[PDB]
C-alpha cells in the first residue's frame, strides 16, 4: 500500500497505468479524419432489450464545430466533457472566435494528472480519469481528430480506435486509410470495422455515428440515416 502519486521502477505512475487498463474494458470507438470532415462511431454495447438505446450517449457535442467520442469508465467522462464545453464558451466569450480542436483537447488534457492526496483542495480529484477521448472537429486548420488518454498525452490522428478491440480495429484502419479518402468512404470503413469487432450483430440502434464537416455543424446520425449506410454493409 502506497500513495496515488507513486512512481513505478519503470518511471510510470501506477495509477495512470492502471487507469489505461480500464480503457480496455470500454466499448470500441473509432474516429477518422478526412479532408471533407471527421466522423466518430461507437459501439453502444446493449446489455438488455429493456435498456433504451438512445440513453447510451457516448458521442457528445462539445460545440457546433467539435464532437467527442469516449471509451472506458463513462461516468468519469462527465467532468471532462463539461470542462471542454465551458472552455469553448469561455473562449468565445473572451475572444469572439471558435476555439481550435487542439486547444480544447489541450485544456481538457491539463486536468489528467491533477489528482493527489495532501497538496490539494478540501475536494480535488483522488485518482486519474478511467477514460480515453477522441475529439473530432473543424477549425481553420481544417478537419481534425485528436486522441487523449488518462496520462494527459494528446495527439492528432488521421484515424484512431479506442476501447476493448482497439488493437484489431487500428490494424484494419491502417489497411483502409488514405489521405485522399472521402468522408462517405470513411463512414462505411468505420461501420465495417465496428461490425467485425463487435460481439453483438451490428444494427441501427446499437451503434452511434456523428460527423463534423467544413460546411456543417456537428451532426448525430438518425436511426433512418444509420439504416441507409448499414445497407451496403
Amino acid at each position: 500500500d502506497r500513495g496515488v502519486n507513486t512512481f513505478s521502477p519503470e518511471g510510470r505512475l501506477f495509477q495512470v497505468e492502471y487507469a489505461i487498463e480500464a480503457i480496455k474494458l470500454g466499448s470500441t470507438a473509432i474516429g477518422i479524419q478526412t479532408s471533407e470532415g471527421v466522423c466518430l462511431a461507437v459501439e453502444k454495447r446493449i446489455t438488455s432489450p429493456l435498456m433504451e438505446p438512445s440513453s447510451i450517449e457516448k458521442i457528445v457535442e462539445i460545440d457546433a464545430h467539435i464532437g467527442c467520442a469516449m471509451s472506458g469508465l463513462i461516468a468519469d467522462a462527465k467532468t471532462l466533457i463539461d470542462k471542454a464545453r465551458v472552455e469553448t464558451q469561455n473562449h468565445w466569450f473572451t475572444y469572439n472566435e471558435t476555439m481550435t480542436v487542439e486547444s480544447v483537447t489541450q485544456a481538457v488534457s491539463n486536468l489528467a494528472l491533477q489528482f493527489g492526496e495532501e497538496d490539494a483542495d478540501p475536494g480535488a480529484m483522488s485518482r486519474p480519469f478511467g477514460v480515453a477521448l477522441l475529439f473530432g472537429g473543424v477549425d481553420e486548420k481544417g478537419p481534425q481528430l485528436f486522441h487523449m488518454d488518462p496520462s494527459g498525452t494528446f495527439v492528432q490522428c488521421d484515424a484512431r480506435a479506442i476501447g476493448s478491440a482497439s488493437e484489431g480495429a487500428q490494424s484494419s484502419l491502417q489497411e483502409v486509410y488514405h489521405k485522399s479518402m472521402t468522408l462517405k468512404e470513411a463512414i462505411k470503413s468505420s461501420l465495417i470495422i465496428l461490425k467485425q469487432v463487435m460481439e453483438e450483430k451490428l444494427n441501427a440502434t446499437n451503434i452511434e455515428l456523428a460527423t463534423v464537416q467544413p460546411g456543417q455543424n456537428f451532426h448525430m446520425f438518425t436511426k433512418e440515416e444509420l439504416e441507409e449506410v448499414i445497407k451496403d454493409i
Binding site: 496515488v4 495509477q15 492502471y18 487498463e21 474494458l25 478511467g130
Partner: peptide
C-alpha cells in the same frame, strides 16, 4: 484517497 485503481483497472 479511498477509491483508487487496482491493477487491471
Amino acid at each position: 484517497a479511498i477509491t483508487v485503481f487496482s491493477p487491471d483497472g
